[PDB]
Amino acid sequence: PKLLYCSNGGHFLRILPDGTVDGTRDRSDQHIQLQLSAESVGEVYIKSTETGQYLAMDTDGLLYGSQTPNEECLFLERLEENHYNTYISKKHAEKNWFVGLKKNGSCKRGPRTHYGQKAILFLPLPVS
To answer: What ranges does the record give for the region Heparin-binding, renumbered to this chain?
Structure first.
């Protein structure tokens, strides 16, 4: 069980009850506890422990909470220099579409992301 803290804006990734995805600075928020599960090595599912929803990216590059674990829900987890991870959509990997947060905490669409961006860097923080 983890938190994913984005160093752009300093937000924890949050999947809202209505399917929305964004970031919240508030560590006591109940929709930021996430469970990561692996299929292949380096391939993960990211699941809201509160609502049981899965993080997902659609075919136009945006993040939604999915009620179903489908192939839009697999991400490639990659360590980068300095301990943070990037999460690349497996289905759209060839387009370099990363899970991302803007500075103001709102989601970043897949086609508007790229390596080097602060928005794409997440620190996984194992919940006690």
So the answer is: 102-118
CA nearest to 76, candidates 95, 50, 60, 49: 95
- Report d(CA 23, CA 90) in Å as an integer: 22
Resolution in A: 2.3
Tokens coding 4: 């994913």
What are the structural domains of the chain?
1-128 (2.80.10.50)
Three-state secondary structure call for residue 110: helix
82 annotated among ligand-binding-site residues: no
Contacts of 89 (CB under 8 A, 6+ apart): 57, 61, 72, 74, 75, 76, 95, 97, 98, 99, 110
Q: Sign of torsion, CA 85 88 90 94?
A: negative
Q: Pick the closest to residue 32 from 44, 16, 56, 8 (CA basis).
A: 16
